Homo-oligomer: A and B are copies of this chain.
């Protein structure tokens, strides 16, 4: 599968290097800036493989601040910085949650291969495989340990579903556990 290898390498290429030190960067911010970060990387997995080159497309999901940068030497890039963004989530207009939110960038490729002049059905199937594979990796992975959540979703249409309520729901079971 293309999606099988896109999921492995997203783990070996990004997650296995940022998740180990993610929660420590979160504590650093939460000390110097109940409206706090959920100590976990919430990966938006748009099943439509629609990832933006710009999360504000769904209101109530608003950017707040950037997480302290992690610099690590990688593949010849000295102090390769790993940047991550913290977003506020709003319910009824008020801040009901703050978390580190970002799209799975590999799903973007499944899109370009299906955006037409693969099939839109193959995209759904392989996006699902990517989610199912990456979730199985992150289950057996030793670096993924109460630090990552895979938010798979599919807005049937723009005038439709509230990701804010979808991600906030995950934020509540966090606090409940």
Q: Is the interface of A mostly helix, strand, loop or mixed?
A: mixed
Question: Is B81 within 8 A of A81, CB to CB?
Answer: yes
8 Å CB contacts to B: which residues of A6-54?
A: 6, 8-9, 12-13, 17, 44, 51-54
- The answer, yes or no, to whether A146 is at the interface (CB within 8 Å) is no
Q: Which of A71-79, A90-98, A154-162, A168-176 contacts B (4 or more CB under 8 A)?
A: A71-79
- The answer, yes or no, to whether A109 is at the interface (CB within 8 Å) is yes
- The answer, yes or no, to whether A59 is at the interface (CB within 8 Å) is no
Question: Is A52 within 8 A of B75, CB to CB?
Answer: yes
Cβ contact of A76, chosen from B2, B8, B75, B101, cutoff 8 A:
B101
> Do A74 and B53 contact each other (CB < 8 Å), given the known contacts A83-B79, A108-B12, A109-B9?
yes
B residues near A113, Cβ cutoff 8 Å: 5, 8
- Using CB atoms and an 8 Å cutoff, list the residues of chain A in contact with chain B: 1-6, 8-9, 12-13, 17, 44, 51-55, 63, 66, 69, 73-81, 83-85, 87, 101-106, 108-109, 112-113
8 other A-B residue contacts (CB within 8 Å) besides A13-B105, A76-B102: A1-B2, A6-B9, A12-B112, A75-B103, A75-B104, A77-B85, A81-B81, A81-B83
